[PDB]
Design a binder for this molecule. Structure first.
Ligand SMILES: Cn1ncc2c(=O)[nH]c(CCC(=O)N3CC[C@@H](C(=O)O)C3)nc21
Length: 167
C-alpha cells in the first residue's frame, strides 16, 4: 500500500491521473519524482521549469554543480539528484526531443531508467514541449517499465484522450 490517490489503473504496474506533477509531488512526497530533463539539466520550461520553480531554483543550482563535475547526460540517460522539497530523490531522465531531431527509438532507453526504482511519480517522457506523441509515449512506458509508475498528466483533455485510446 502507498499514498497515491485517485489514479486509474492501466496495467499491473502503470497508473495515470490528471494532475499537476508539482502539486502531486508536494502532497505525496514520493521517494522518486521524475523530471523531464535535457542533457544540460537546464530546467527552463515544461515539467522541468515547473519542478525547478517549485524548489525556488535549488534544483537548478544543484544541477549546475552536477554538470560542472560530470558533463552532460546522454539522450536516453538519467541521473539521481535531490528531490528538494518535492520528493526524497529526483530522477532526471532525458527523453529524445523531437523538436531537436533526436531519435524517437531512444524513448525506450529513457523509460528503462525507471526500472531502477521500485515506485515513481513521473510525467510522460518526451511529451509536451519535447514534441513526441503522448499516446506513443504511454505505449512505450507500459511496454518498458516494470516497476510501479504513477503518471501525472497536466492537461485534462490529453488525459481523457490517453485513457480513451489506451489498448
Ligand atoms: C506556481 N504556479 N501557480 C499557478 C501556476 C500555473 O498556472 N502554471 C504553472 C506552470 C506549471 C507547468 O508548466 N506544468 C505542471 C505540469 C507540467 C506537465 O507538463 O506535466 C507542466 N505554475 C503555476
Amino acid at each position: 500500500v502507498n499514498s497515491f490517490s485517485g489514479y486509474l489503473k492501466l496495467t499491473d504496474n502503470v497508473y495515470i491521473k490528471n494532475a499537476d506533477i508539482v502539486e502531486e509531488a508536494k502532497k505525496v512526497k514520493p521517494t522518486v519524482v521524475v523530471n523531464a530533463a535535457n542533457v544540460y539539466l537546464k530546467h527552463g520550461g515544461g515539467v522541468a521549469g515547473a519542478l525547478n520553480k517549485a524548489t525556488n531554483n535549488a534544483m537548478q543550482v544543484e544541477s549546475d554543480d552536477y554538470i560542472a563535475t560530470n558533463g552532460p547526460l546522454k539522450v536516453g540517460g538519467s541521473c539521481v539528484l535531490s528531490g528538494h522539497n518535492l520528493a526524497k530523490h529526483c530522477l532526471h531522465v532525458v527523453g529524445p526531443n523531437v523538436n531537436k531531431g533526436e531519435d524517437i527509438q531512444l524513448l525506450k532507453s529513457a523509460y528503462e531508467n525507471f526500472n531502477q526504482h521500485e515506485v515513481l511519480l513521473a510525467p510522460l517522457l518526451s511529451a509536451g514541449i519535447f514534441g513526441a506523441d503522448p499516446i506513443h509515449s504511454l505505449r512505450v512506458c507500459v511496454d518498458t517499465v516494470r516497476t510501479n509508475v504513477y503518471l501525472a498528466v497536466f492537461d485534462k483533455n490529453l488525459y481523457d484522450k490517453l485513457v480513451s485510446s489506451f489498448l
